[PDB]
Write a new protein. Structure first.
Lengths: 176, 176, 176, 176, 176, 176
């Protein structure tokens, strides 16, 4: 899937053997973690003007790509609790068709390239593109890289669960 | 436009002279204010199980109806500052394709039938159905009815502006 | 229009080329600002015993004069945000037939002749004579003259909007 | 199973396709969520005098019905973390034969029909009827309906796990 | 118009279709937003030593170019309230011939390339080159890019209003 | 496997049906819980001088024995949330080859034989022998025995998950 604006040009191809090359080494690493714990190969390429636009538009495109790949009847709910050294991060997803993100982190030891702004904009992008409810809740930790990487690992693991096929439409209201 | 779940059954028809009859007298009043200040006739009918499901699903259906009704090129931005006796409420809308709501109110004198829960759920529904950014920011006020009605009046006025036809795609990124 | 008591004798004639001469140089200046931003010539003359009675009775007479000049179907709502150097003042008017004034200012650097008492009594007079809801909300500023003059400039601009002719009775209740 | 007092008359039949009709529309909705996420059809009918007696006695009767339905050797432990928009609620169950409930919620935006009293009394009833340890721990959230519905969804999911057949008596002390 | 010092060399040509290329990608994006919402084509090119000198001198030069472009009699006042996701920013301009800037923002989630220092210096440069009073007041928000971009969008929209032709000298003192 | 120092002499044999007999009745009970929820038979015998050296060295030896027992490719991650009456304890494990323990508990009602010192030293021993990251985070609770026992139950359950065979090396860096 390709999404192109005047700001960014992004390809996300889920289930395809390929490199993740966004021209942002931090995001390449985070997306590698996400794909690995999701349990899917993917090819991702991007060009961009500003890193915010990249992280957001990657979130949106990835979310749309996951939505396109979603079985007609899907599990809907998935969670992960991801430790990474000092970090302990809860990730909870509901593929609800109600875009919402709540990212609650507390970075004590900052690291160049890792920013809460960028994390939040990726997650809101993902929530909007997938049309999902996403909570990221830090339970412990100080290190920026461990916290953010735990969040991406957790997103991958939670979405592994939530995107599996189900026998039914997973809502009491009869529609998702 | 009709939206039907096991919880609610809603029809919203913009531009048709008709009744607003939701079987919730508070919501009927608030929607009447909204339609009046938007400057458009509309017919709205609904059945529901619980009031929260009604307020939310009315927001969603109304938002989708407004989105369907938009000119290809639209003004995108609209604001209103709405006084109502003690209440003074700022409503700011960006038809951004990025669902978001922030409803920041402070009700001192409560009134039966008016609930922040219901206002928030309508606004989030509208933000999700229209695919828009919506801020409701109370500047002054105490009375629940004045605050909530000012918000609905302000939403009508802000959307009156934001849904008008434009000569261009109103985004520097070239797409909405 | 003339209003005469044992305390004051006031003439306000809107749409007439003339001087504003109240025998209070501060009020003459504030009224000049008001008329200029309203976009109307006016003639105003007054005699008075005490400045409070002047500012109040000018408010009342001006409000009655605006009410007499109001089209049968009028726009009802008008706002202004007026910067003046350090001052930034929001003025929001609803010609509601529900007299109410809320003047929320915070003068740090006082100036002879400018008093919150006098401002409040003018505004309450205006609200009572016009039969309107009036909010003045200081958003920024320290200087008494800039804050009060911004309020009068803003009143003029807000009433310019609110006193324009409309195609309809601007109330969902069918009466104003 | 039928439980009858001078206050309430309740039938709960697990595994029968049937209606959930308690004459309380909120509880009907919450029980529908519970049964849906438990993954079991059930028929529930009730009459009652006061809502508290209904919520409590429904908990008791449902708990007894679940206890009667358990395989001799059961999994005992089950958890769910349930997001619902702003709400994020942890539900942790141990079918311990030691009745206990701790419901730790924080409702900011109240909603008519939803009460912490009623939630607590249902959960304590369920803990006493099933003979179980039940924690409901709010991690995030403001909305009453989202919080309470997340708790019922989470209870269904947690009990789905805890009520599954096991190869052994799940206790180091050799008895449950 | 061209402005050259030992620090910077800047060309701003309002009304010419052309590139905005300052050798600062963040400023290019912000000026693109500014020009788009002002509603005028412009060509802007720059070289510079240090980003602060660029942002400031661009503000000065753009301000001078706008001043040169004004009709003899101009509207003087303009406002915008600009939402951008979480951000909600008020921009209020008075082309007063009294240089003044007050930039009141609160960035919670910082982003590389975006700095309050640079925003303030651009706005002070603009106020000084145009000879204007400029308030930027954040009402809501956390994200640096959303806040700063909302300010530039808002400046564009406010100056669109303020730079229009008027029938009169817009001052009670008879000169601007 | 056997580990002998001048302080302790410990045998841990995973997969062998046998006694857990450490000459510390509290540790015997905790290890019984651990083994039961891990789902593996084991024989553990020990002699010791001081209880701290026992708890630590048991942790080390058990960790080494688990490490020796791992398949070449293992699941790596495992979590448990364990209620025990008032206690609710999160246990999160990553068999990371990066020894780390964070035991975050809050015992209100102390009990003879149970000490935070001993729990921490067991967990650090285990993290160091297995070469793993281990978080024990109390979410609720007062009673020492319930809290500590929930931690051991949870460690068993979490390691049941983490020690299973995987089809791949579970790390984006390609080595563990
Ligand atoms: O989570 P869902 O949509 O499956 C069912 C809910 O009952 C719908 N809802 C949304 N807000 C309150 N209720
Ligand atoms: O508001 P838009 O989408 O027209 C242009 C913005 O540049 C896009 N954006 C979204 N977050 C940061 N920038
Ligand atoms: O503002 P109005 O009078 O047009 C209509 C309102 O519904 C009347 N009202 C006055 N208080 C509460 N409602
Ligand atoms: O949780 P159980 O009943 O399987 C075993 C526990 O050892 C019993 N216990 C209850 N309080 C303290 N210990
Ligand atoms: O805003 P202006 O210059 O049009 C007229 C003001 O009265 C001048 N002024 C400046 N400070 C106080 N008053
Ligand atoms: O958790 P791992 O070792 O599988 C991969 C991580 O990227 C390595 N890392 C360790 N600290 C920061 N990153
Ligand atoms: Mn963004
Ligand atoms: Mn890493
Ligand atoms: Mn809802
Ligand atoms: Mn009303
Ligand atoms: Mn008085
Ligand atoms: Mn003056
Ligand atoms: Mn009771
Ligand atoms: Mn519901
Ligand atoms: Mn400078
Ligand atoms: Mn941008
Ligand atoms: Mn030690
Ligand atoms: Mn015990």
């Amino acid at each position: 899937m390709r999404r192109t604006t005047k700001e960014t040009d992004i390809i996300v191809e889920i289930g395809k053997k390929g490199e993740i090359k966004t021209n942002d080494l931090i995001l390449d690493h985070m997306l590698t973690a996400f794909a690995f714990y999701l349990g899917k190969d993917m090819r991702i390429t991007a060009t961009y003007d500003l890193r915010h636009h990249l992280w957001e538009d990657i979130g949106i495109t990835l979310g749309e790509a996951l939505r396109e790949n979603l079985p007609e009847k899907f599990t809907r709910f998935g969670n992960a609790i991801m430790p990474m050294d000092d970090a302990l991060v809860l990730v909870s997803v509901d593929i609800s068709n109600r875009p919402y993100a709540n990212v609650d982190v507390n970075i004590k030891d900052a690291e160049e390239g890792f920013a809460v702004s960028l994390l939040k904009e990726f997650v809101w992008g993902l929530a909007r593109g997938l049309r999902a409810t996403i909570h990221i809740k830090q339970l412990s930790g100080e290190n920026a890289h461990h916290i953010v990487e735990a969040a991406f690992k957790g997103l991958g693991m939670a979405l592994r669960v939530a995107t599996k096929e189900s026998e039914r439409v997973e809502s009491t209201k009869g529609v998702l």
